[PDB]
Amino acid sequence: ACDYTCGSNCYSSSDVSTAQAAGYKLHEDGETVGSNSYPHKYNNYEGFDFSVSSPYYEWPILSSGDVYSGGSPGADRVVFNENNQLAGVITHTGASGNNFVECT
Numbered sequence: 001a002c003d004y005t006c007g008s009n010c011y012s013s014s015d016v017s018t019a020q021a022a023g024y025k026l027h028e029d030g031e032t033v034g035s036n037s038y039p040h041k042y043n044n045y046e047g048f049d050f051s052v053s054s055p056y057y058e059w060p061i062l063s064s065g066d067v068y069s070g071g072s073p074g075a076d077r078v079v080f081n082e083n084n085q086l087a088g089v090i091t092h093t094g095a096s097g098n099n100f101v102e103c104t
């Protein structure tokens, strides 16, 4: 069973922890990767009711199982905060334009 289902992409907790650790490390060091500069702030324009506090950051999580290192980020993201607490796993899949919906 999937811990998080983003459209048809299936993630375990392990996938999420791995992606989040990479994104948080870059965040801590002040470095980014890719043309969209990940990780970057996530403004929560959608207004998700995250259980942890802002500020929030987003980092791509890939269905290949690899950690994001540039190139296309796909549709899915992990959102973490300043304390490296996971806020949620979100996706552009099934959402209009560049909006997001929560992975289930």
Ligand SMILES: Nc1nc2c(ncn2[C@@H]2O[C@H](CO)[C@@H](O)[C@H]2OP(=O)(O)O)c(=O)[nH]1
Pocket (backbone or CB within 6 Å): 036, 041, 042, 043, 044, 045, 046, 058, 098, 099, 100
């Ligand atoms: N939909 C949405 N996009 C956000 C938010 N915060 C940042 N973004 C970024 O704002 C622009 C509009 O979607 C894009 O740069 C998107 O980038 P990402 O694709 O990297 O998430 C947010 O809270 N909601």
Ligand SMILES: [Ca+2]
Pocket (backbone or CB within 6 Å): 010, 011, 012, 015, 065
């Ligand atoms: Ca996996």
